[PDB]
Amino acid sequence: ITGIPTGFTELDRMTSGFQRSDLIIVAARPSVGKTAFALNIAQNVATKTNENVAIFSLEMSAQQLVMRMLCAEGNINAQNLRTGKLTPEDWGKLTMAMGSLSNAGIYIDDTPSIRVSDIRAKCRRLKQESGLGMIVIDYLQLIQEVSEISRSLKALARELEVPVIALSQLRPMMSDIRESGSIEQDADIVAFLYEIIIAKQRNGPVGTVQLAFIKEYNKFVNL
């Protein structure tokens, strides 16, 4: 928080951000997960201060991803909220799911197998269409032919005057996003998911940190 917030408070007394203009890539593992990380980098940042956001969910329809953060803001995902009529009970903690995620400003996404000149013409009228605090783009291994995308993703944080995010689906270290990309000369802060191995910057702080998980509500935990 310098800044329009990063992710965690021990991760906002670590590196410090998000600040003015940064290309980011959180090279996220298969098998383990990358779902709730989005439900804990851009879930509460829209629903508190008027530096609003947007969500790129490319390959899947944006609407299947809306069973992920409402079932993680209203803590209701075990009766269940992904298939129809609940038992006369789980209509309990609904007042926390959408009761904050509509008084902010977000554009969720699933527009075609995109190149990147979209978010250049789109972000010339979405900087002027939204409110802007972060710009959450899909993982760096689909948009096309993979390496070129990251190179022109550095400048994107420098146009709308807000830091821009684009994860990845390749241990995990900086030489596996390499067996499918370029990145190093471009993105100058590479976090991860096993463990958010933020092992890159000039600001100072870089550390070894994983967090606990619940997966009945998809919740992150810091201490």
Partner: protein, 244 residues
């Protein structure tokens, strides 16, 4: 919500924290197919140390008996004669509980102990049709024919998942072949006392005898196998004339 149900289901076995540690397991457990395709295995929870793992009339129908002859399992109660303390000191623990059987509150089974031939298994196969008036997946088994093919190997990772925490287990006979049975039934009888469950017994010998016969060496692993079988109930006599 599923977690709540499971938690209280096995709260006798689980250490609150153990539940949250094995959360991934228990959640993956419920999320996957609770059934199989041979009807070849089904998932069941097991407590391993500090972690919980996942191992694989119109009254006799959906039942699933193991290693038994096909049509011998038909027995009633009017037809069962009522004689000595073989049948006049037993219908006092049987009938106090009929239409009143819970899970989430341990029930009393029985241990039919005595002779060689009188009536070992006619008070575990008759009541299996009181567990057919309501219809449970009530198990009926020969334990002489159980420590043989499961010594074998092929398939062996999970062979006793229907001989642990089924709603009913009418165990019949153990009279053949520090034993090959202390990480086997001695931990099978562990899940019959912390996931809220009762069991049913009948055999050839008796409690005194079986303790003096199990597991021998040059180790009280012979006198721990049988109070895992003298806990939920108190054993009573069987007496009368021979039946052959």
């Amino acid at each position: 919500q599923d977690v709540q149900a499971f938690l209280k289901e096995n709260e006798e076995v689980i250490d609150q924290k153990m539940i949250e540690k094995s959360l991934n397991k228990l959640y993956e457990y419920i999320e996957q197919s609770k059934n199989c395709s041979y009807c070849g295995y089904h998932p069941k929870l097991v407590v391993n140390g500090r972690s919980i793992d996942i191992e694989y009339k119109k009254q006799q129908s959906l039942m699933k008996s193991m290693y038994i002859q096909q049509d011998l399992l038909g027995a009633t109660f009017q037809q069962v004669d009522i004689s000595d303390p073989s049948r006049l000191a037993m219908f006092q623990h049987v009938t106090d509980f009929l239409k009143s059987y819970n899970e989430t509150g341990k029930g009393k089974g029985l241990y039919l102990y005595g002779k060689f031939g009188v009536g070992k298994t006619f008070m575990l196969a008759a009541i299996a049709n009181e567990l057919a008036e309501k219809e449970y997946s009530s198990m009926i088994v020969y334990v002489p024919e159980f420590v043989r093919e499961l010594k074998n190997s092929q398939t062996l990772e999970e062979k006793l998942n229907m001989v642990k925490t089924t709603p009913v287990l009418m165990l019949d006979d153990i009279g053949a072949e520090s034993w090959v049975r202390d990480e086997v039934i001695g931990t099978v009888l562990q899940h019959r006392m912390s996931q809220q469950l009762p069991t049913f017994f009948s055999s050839n010998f008796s409690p005194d005898e079986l303790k003096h016969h199990f597991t021998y060496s040059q180790e009280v692993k012979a006198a721990r196998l049988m109070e895992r079988i003298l806990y939920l109930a108190a054993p009573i006599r069987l007496d009368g004339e021979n039946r052959r």
